[PDB]
Design an enzyme around this catalytic site. Structure first.
Site, PDB file in Angstrom:
ATOM      1  N   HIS A  14      -3.715  -4.890   0.824  1.00 23.45           N
ATOM      2  CA  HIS A  14      -3.262  -5.731   1.651  1.00 23.45           C
ATOM      3  C   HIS A  14      -3.340  -7.077   1.566  1.00 23.45           C
ATOM      4  O   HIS A  14      -4.350  -7.887   1.545  1.00 23.45           O
ATOM      5  CB  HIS A  14      -3.724  -5.257   2.940  1.00 23.45           C
ATOM      6  CG  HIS A  14      -3.376  -3.856   3.530  1.00 23.45           C
ATOM      7  ND1 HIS A  14      -2.583  -3.843   4.477  1.00 23.45           N
ATOM      8  CD2 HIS A  14      -4.025  -2.570   3.245  1.00 23.45           C
ATOM      9  CE1 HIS A  14      -2.343  -2.431   4.621  1.00 23.45           C
ATOM     10  NE2 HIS A  14      -3.316  -1.688   4.011  1.00 23.45           N
ATOM     11  N   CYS A  30       0.955  -1.230  -0.042  1.00 22.49           N
ATOM     12  CA  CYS A  30      -0.033  -0.089   0.051  1.00 22.49           C
ATOM     13  C   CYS A  30       0.845   1.178  -0.122  1.00 22.49           C
ATOM     14  O   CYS A  30       1.142   1.678  -1.036  1.00 22.49           O
ATOM     15  CB  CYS A  30      -0.963   0.184   1.190  1.00 22.49           C
ATOM     16  SG  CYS A  30      -2.227   1.155   0.743  1.00 22.49           S
ATOM     17  N   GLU A  63      -1.937  -9.703   2.842  1.00 19.76           N
ATOM     18  CA  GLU A  63      -1.660 -10.601   4.169  1.00 19.76           C
ATOM     19  C   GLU A  63      -2.972 -10.989   4.657  1.00 19.76           C
ATOM     20  O   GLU A  63      -3.125 -12.069   5.689  1.00 19.76           O
ATOM     21  CB  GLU A  63      -0.744  -9.650   5.141  1.00 19.76           C
ATOM     22  CG  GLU A  63      -1.500  -8.382   5.442  1.00 19.76           C
ATOM     23  CD  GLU A  63      -1.120  -7.129   4.699  1.00 19.76           C
ATOM     24  OE1 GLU A  63      -0.923  -5.949   5.232  1.00 19.76           O
ATOM     25  OE2 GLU A  63      -0.631  -7.491   3.342  1.00 19.76           O
TER      26      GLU A  63
HETATM   27  N1  LIG Z   1      -3.001   1.272   4.085  1.00 18.68           N
HETATM   28  C1  LIG Z   1      -2.126   2.028   4.131  1.00 18.68           C
HETATM   29  O1  LIG Z   1      -0.719   1.777   3.891  1.00 18.68           O
HETATM   30  C2  LIG Z   1      -2.466   3.548   3.903  1.00 18.68           C
HETATM   31  C3  LIG Z   1      -1.565   4.295   2.998  1.00 18.68           C
HETATM   32  C4  LIG Z   1      -1.991   5.720   2.774  1.00 18.68           C
HETATM   33  N2  LIG Z   1      -1.577   6.342   3.998  1.00 18.68           N
HETATM   34  C5  LIG Z   1      -3.519   5.906   2.191  1.00 18.68           C
HETATM   35  O2  LIG Z   1      -4.231   6.379   3.058  1.00 18.68           O
HETATM   36  O3  LIG Z   1      -3.753   5.530   0.823  1.00 18.68           O
END
Ligand SMILES: NC(=O)CC[C@H](N)C(=O)O
Ligand SMILES: CCOc1cncc(-c2ccc(C(=O)NC3(c4csc(NS(=O)(=O)C5CC5)n4)CC3)nc2)n1
Ligand SMILES: CCOc1cncc(-c2ccc(C(=O)NC3(c4csc(NS(=O)(=O)C5CC5)n4)CC3)nc2)n1
Ligand SMILES: CCOc1cncc(-c2ccc(C(=O)NC3(c4csc(NS(=O)(=O)C5CC5)n4)CC3)nc2)n1
Ligand SMILES: O=c1ccn([C@@H]2O[C@H](COP(=O)(O)OP(=O)(O)OP(=O)(O)O)[C@@H](O)[C@H]2O)c(=O)[nH]1
Ligand SMILES: O=c1ccn([C@@H]2O[C@H](COP(=O)(O)OP(=O)(O)OP(=O)(O)O)[C@@H](O)[C@H]2O)c(=O)[nH]1
Ligand SMILES: O=c1ccn([C@@H]2O[C@H](COP(=O)(O)OP(=O)(O)OP(=O)(O)O)[C@@H](O)[C@H]2O)c(=O)[nH]1
Ligand SMILES: NC(=O)CC[C@H](N)C(=O)O
Ligand SMILES: NC(=O)CC[C@H](N)C(=O)O
Ligand SMILES: [Mg+2]
Ligand SMILES: [Mg+2]
Ligand SMILES: [Mg+2]
Lengths: 542, 542, 542
Positions: free
Chosen positions: B511, B392, B513
């Protein structure tokens, strides 16, 4: 007068009695006369009812009070001698109130917990706190009251209610509540868990006592975020939350309380105008390069606390001769040929520890369980000339064994293990139990213990025994190596015995360990450590 | 239907969620359809309100429920996918009851905890327990309800009261209470302390729930005398007291419950006519001789639970390639040149761990704190060809960095860290937050992840992000090494990126995971472990 | 600022709100600006959710807060006007905290009862206690906080915990706890039972609040041995135990508190340099020889508290004209011909009470239940010229009836009872509900109420209604006896109606009773009492 209540949270075994004793030694260093009261919320009248496995060693007072090992901690940290009634119990309080009721002292009114039991507790505490335990004929300034158990123990609640009331008689300049709690950490990668402490202080506040200090016991140091989490949720200022982590010697626990500002707290709050003895013992203890390996051939060895005073007396002695104690706690039953059949590895481990013994200690106890394994170790010590200290039962066994092996009286034993022993060499000789302080007179000027005790004509030591040497059968020993060097003031009781042909093989009928202090090791334990390191001859010439 | 309530004693952190998950996996192995409910007695509506440091990783469900990591444990131990309302909270229950009250649904009667809140809890539990989390369109047989917190938590008491009532609707053949408690041991030479468990079960019984099972958590095995002491004082049969000591792998915790007869208990009590998958994983895990050293360059490293799903996905992958994971959790702030001034030893330790990295993992997070340290690790990975997985934020940073370092757009950043970035390459692009399951379509046939995912046209993965790649500025990357291989079904969102010139340098916007299971490692984590051990080329040929 | 918490023991219904109101009137007589807060530990957001049978009359504030009758007691004993947020509820507090949580105001931390709910309570109390309810634009000196429910109510415990904390912010010179308890006596030949009070104070002390005063409510006076038994076992000084026995008028309850030394207690403790109004009302009340018999034809008659403000407004009026009120509470269902079949004795008792009516009161309510019995009484009043006051529903019914019986529009009714009424004379006309203070303008100079209200052009009165007179159908009444003398400031709403041909037949759309005070009887209630005793003509000439 001033009162410090020390209450336990989560679990009792986190050294709350060491906190109470260290709190007392801080006040002692501040120049105060300090007394101590233990409350044990059990219905048992005295610790003489217990097996050692239940609560640890049954500590014996001068008056013949059989009490908890925490009274021994008070006597070791503070230069005091306590009396029976410094141990409060629920049994003692309820019996007192029942006895008052049966005399009509409560005037035909309905006797009940509040007021009458809670009055009896406050009555007892006030009256016993005025007693001169300090040896000085002057009422002490401060009473450290350890409330035993946990603040979850339903039996303890009458005492907490009594102290809720007492806090309003003895005001907040007089009455302080220290709460000792556990902060567990299941793994080092998870949070230190304050929730038990939060819940425990919420319970204590529900019982109407406010923590002046919250003592957080933990393995590792408490993190500052965890300290603040305790502060917020226990509703206490950060100065009142103290971290007592694990430290390298007992002598640092007063110093860690000092470092955490507990000395400052009490100096401020009590208005008192430092712990250099503790620092000296602590810093010296870490630097000891030498080791003395002592075999403790005990039957209660399954819990080391069963021989707490004995171990502490050895460690006083070890520190005094600048050696570390390797206390080889041997379970005496393992030395018996029964265990050679049943568990041969334990047998040869136990016998290997007995081979490694620079000195051999046979502590006291009751019954025949493991007591042949004590005789195995005394036989080893006697023949291979290993430095020996037999306490009470260990004296009786040594006398019996010398009769068997050196006088050929193979039929000799106690009227305890075999009531109908053919030559009853050790016999029941009541006074009741020979219990508390008695005067033993030395009746052999060339005895080792006399000289270790400062070349005195008599000593006064703490006894806890029913059995004696049968005074007729002393005629067997009369002109042989085993000399009865110490007798009672009544003469008809043999209280110390020595092998004249051995560098150190002592039987004492009393318990010297109860009289032992950090800067005054009990001489029979000192002699063992000295003999085990060859320093005895040098010490006695000095 | 059947219900197992799992209640916590003393402290919450003793793996009560692993007990609940292992209880479910035992029932699963017995052939039952199992669902799970977590109750978190906090007033927070969802875990999306939290910092990772508060409760660990905010686990994301398919519906975009931001929930506790215990719902992740249910999804890892049981082949289920949960919905928002499988997380109950006091906030959700009270708001529901307030909303009912404001509509007049409670008919002008005084709304109060018992009945109305406790009815709402039972209503919720009954209705959600009927929901097909098992993917099969059939109502499950058993609901494992984990009551979070401790049985001392005042917020939890409404749920315990609700379950007291529920135990009389769902009878004792249906409703079981398992109580998970801590038995601490302050030192190995003192007694294992059952008093917290005694007191905790007394509290639970006071709330009108009887333990069917008492799970004693401890480090060491519980002694039989300690087990009997629990049995007597908790008023439970010895078969109902179970010892869950620490064991060498997670895969043995179901087996230890099986060994302690919990499977027998439930087979008998539920009338069910085994855990070979668990035994296979367990016994294989201990025998892994090889190691893969992964650098987890994570800003939330201060508590490892902040990356629980990520660590578990790596361990699934590590086990699947028969290597042990050396997970080098690096706080990314330590890699920043600020820490070279402030704490040079931490800096060079962190950089040494980054040198030892067989693969580099940059997990997700929110805010600029530690972002420069993540960029430092991505730069290291990019240039020195170290296997890389960016999740992300780690995708966003990799895209930003490639723009800076390879496209010379040194002014590139996110409109998160610098809102007024000159070339705003990563921009806020709400749907609110792109949250839960979304379809990412592969738009490059030669991509590594496509083949790892089974050569599929699209994948559906769990998202939790507000920011996106700005779709105009993709023109900068168009004919260069960094290829946007995966996009959303709407096209205007870049969801996977790969360096075409690197053996494994992956950014994913989702994500992976949260979708990882013990015998189905999430392919981006598998590819990292494979690349880090050279096995990726072999696997993709296979 | 100063705070008096008034907590309830055993049972709530023992006049704890009269104690709180009398405590305030003592402080008012001492010259203090007094405000009041009611806490109702129910989850209901407002009393507008309730049936009158649940808690008594839903009292209406100027802002349109629908609140408990205890806020009416504050407004009757103290010359104050309260606002919505002077009623705290668990619903209001939990929703506020949930709304804060959902905005992220709690910064991603776990929201829980202590601190966050207990902070919200203290926040609310501090902020609302500064509000000028006294009409004077100056912050009050003292806040009387009535904690509703009992100290056994689990929902109340968050407020008691909040006040435990608050007692340590607002110190013991600021914060006082008064505990109101019941001392029952099952028979006059047995002991007055203090055990409920003992147990209740033990609970309060367990929650960490100490009674400053214990108010023992009983029928008979408390015996001195019983007073001492309370003192000892509640752990409070005899001066802090007060006896509030039953007395001949409400006006003596402040005087009995004064006599018991509560005025002395607060004068000493607050340092204040008397209740002659109360004594004047009290001593006059006992001496009233004359009686006025008023028929209260009320559907909620089953609990008299359902018309508490109405009864109190009549008693203010009765006292002001030096008559005793014989308030004949008639359940209007008994006047209906249905009850002539079902229970003919109740019917003829109800109609006999209606024959004995010197004046007839038809109070407000919602629904068709008992409406035909109200119409039967209005018909009786209209034709036999009996003095009539119709409140809200009683206006609507009078307008409907005059249409039926005098305009021959027999098909007239409300779109409440029959939605599809052929000539819908009373229609739903929302603003939602016309709720709280609104200006009614007089539009007939020769009206009775105008002159009773002091010959004013308009009045501002408290409304609680959804239905109105349909403004077209006013054309039917235009030149007939029933004159719409009062309208809203918007004109399109008829708010007062009078029969021009009748000595006193008033419909008002508002609730005048909420504005009534002991030395300022609400003019429509005054006019009823005056008309019923012939004194109206004399008063209007005066
Ligand atoms: N899930 C994250 O790693 C968030 C990444 C970033 N701060 C966003 O809001 O896209
Ligand atoms: C709140 C407690 O927290 C912590 C934290 N960290 C460590 C310890 C700790 C507890 C007990 C022991 C202990 O028993 N040590 C021994 C000894 C010698 S002398 C004596 N006690 S004594 O004579 O009464 C008087 C002189 C002090 N004990 C060697 C046997 N050592 C360390 N306690
Ligand atoms: C009642 C608990 O008592 C005890 C007693 N002794 C030990 C443990 C214990 C607790 C957690 C862990 C752990 O986290 N191990 C890891 C892992 C891999 S896979 C996964 N979990 S999982 O995917 O949900 C599903 C497959 C199981 N975890 C490596 C990271 N390992 C041991 N727990
Ligand atoms: C702690 C209470 O203990 C006791 C002990 N003994 C007796 C009472 C008692 C309680 C209520 C009542 C009552 O309701 N009486 C009426 C009335 C008139 S005016 C008004 N209240 S009032 O306007 O708010 C403001 C001016 C006072 N009430 C006639 C209807 N009368 C007596 N209460
Ligand atoms: O499983 C869960 C669910 C919810 N919660 C809830 O989270 C909040 C914090 O519960 P904790 O047990 O983390 O308490 P704490 O941080 O105050 O204390 P320690 O960790 O230092 O022991 C409480 O409101 C609890 O009910 C959990 O602890 N665990
Ligand atoms: O300091 C003291 C005094 C007295 N007691 C009293 O001894 C009894 C046993 O108190 P324990 O704390 O030993 O409890 P237990 O053996 O039942 O449980 P664990 O040790 O396994 O945790 C209780 O009645 C208590 O009040 C102490 O525990 N400690
Ligand atoms: O039936 C019985 C037996 C015993 N007792 C016992 O007598 C003692 C007094 O119990 P009471 O109920 O008489 O209490 P009290 O006198 O303190 O308070 P009140 O009467 O004013 O309410 C308590 O210890 C109780 O358990 C009874 O009250 N009744
Ligand atoms: N203290 C002990 O060692 C007791 C020894 C022996 N059983 C006696 O009573 O004499
Ligand atoms: N306050 C009342 O008497 C209500 C009257 C009617 N039910 C309305 O809603 O207007
Ligand atoms: Mg926590
Ligand atoms: Mg124990
Ligand atoms: Mg009585």
């Amino acid at each position: 007068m001033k009162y410090i209540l020390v209450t336990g949270g989560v679990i009792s075994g986190i050294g709350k009695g060491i906190i109470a004793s260290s709190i007392g030694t801080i006040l002692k260093s501040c120049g105060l006369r300090v007394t101590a009261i233990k409350i044990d919320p059990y219905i048992n009248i005295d610790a003489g009812t217990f097996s050692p496995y239940e609560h640890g060693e049954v500590f014996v007072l001068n008056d013949g009070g059989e009490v908890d090992l925490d009274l021994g901690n008070y006597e070791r940290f503070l230069d005091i001698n306590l009396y029976k009634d410094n141990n409060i119990t629920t049994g003692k309080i309820y019996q007192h109130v029942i006895n008052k009721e049966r005399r009509g002292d409560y005037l035909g009114k309905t006797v009940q917990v509040v007021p009458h039991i809670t009055d009896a507790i406050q009555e007892w505490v006030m009256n016993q706190a005025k007693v001169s335990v300090d040896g000085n004929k002057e009422d002490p300034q401060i009473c450290v009251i350890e409330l035993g158990g946990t603040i979850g123990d339903i039996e303890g609640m009458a005492f907490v209610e009594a102290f809720r009331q007492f806090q309003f008689k003895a005001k907040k300049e007089n009455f302080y509540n220290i709460h000792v709690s556990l902060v567990p950490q299941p793994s080092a990668t998870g949070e230190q868990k304050t929730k038990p402490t939060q819940n425990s202080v919420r319970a204590l506040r529900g019982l109407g006592l406010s923590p002046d200090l919250i003592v957080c016991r933990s393995s590792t140091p408490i993190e500052m975020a965890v300290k603040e989490k305790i502060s917020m949720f226990c509703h206490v200022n950060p100065e009142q939350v103290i971290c007592i982590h694990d430290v390298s010697s007992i002598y640092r626990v007063p110093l860690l309380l000092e470092e955490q500002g507990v000395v400052k707290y009490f100096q401020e709050r009590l208005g008192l105008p430092l712990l250099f003895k503790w620092k000296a013992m602590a810093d010296r203890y870490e630097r000891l390069q030498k080791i003395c390996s002592i075999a403790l051939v005990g039957k209660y060895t399954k819990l080391r606390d069963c021989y707490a005073s004995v171990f502490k007396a050895l460690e006083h002695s070890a520190l005094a001769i600048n050696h570390k104690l390797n206390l080889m706690y041997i379970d005496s039953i393992d030395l018996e040929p029964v265990t050679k059949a049943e568990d041969p590895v334990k047998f040869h481990e136990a016998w290997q520890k007995l081979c490694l013994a620079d000195g051999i200690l046979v502590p006291g106890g009751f019954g025949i369980r493991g007591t042949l394994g004590k005789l195995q170790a005394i036989s080893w010590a006697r023949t291979k000339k290993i430095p020996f200290l037999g306490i009470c039962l260990g004296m009786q066994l040594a006398v019996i064994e010398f009769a068997r092996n050196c006088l050929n009286l193979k039929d000799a034993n106690s009227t305890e293990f075999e009531p109908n022993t053919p030559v009853p060499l050790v016999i029941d000789m009541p006074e009741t139990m020979r219990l508390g302080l008695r005067r033993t007179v030395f009746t052999t000027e060339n005895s080792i213990l006399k000289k270790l005790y400062g070349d005195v004509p008599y000593i006064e030591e703490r006894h806890r025994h029913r059995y004696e040497v049968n005074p007729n059968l002393i005629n067997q020993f009369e002109n042989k190596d085993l000399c009865f060097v110490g007798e009672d003031v009544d003469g008809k009781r043999m209280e110390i015995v020595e092998l004249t042909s051995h560098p150190y093989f002592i039987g004492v009928q009393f318990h010297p360990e109860f009289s032992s202090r950090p800067m005054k090791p009990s001489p029979p334990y000192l002699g063992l450590l000295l003999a085990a390191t060859g320093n005895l001859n040098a010490h006695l010439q000095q």
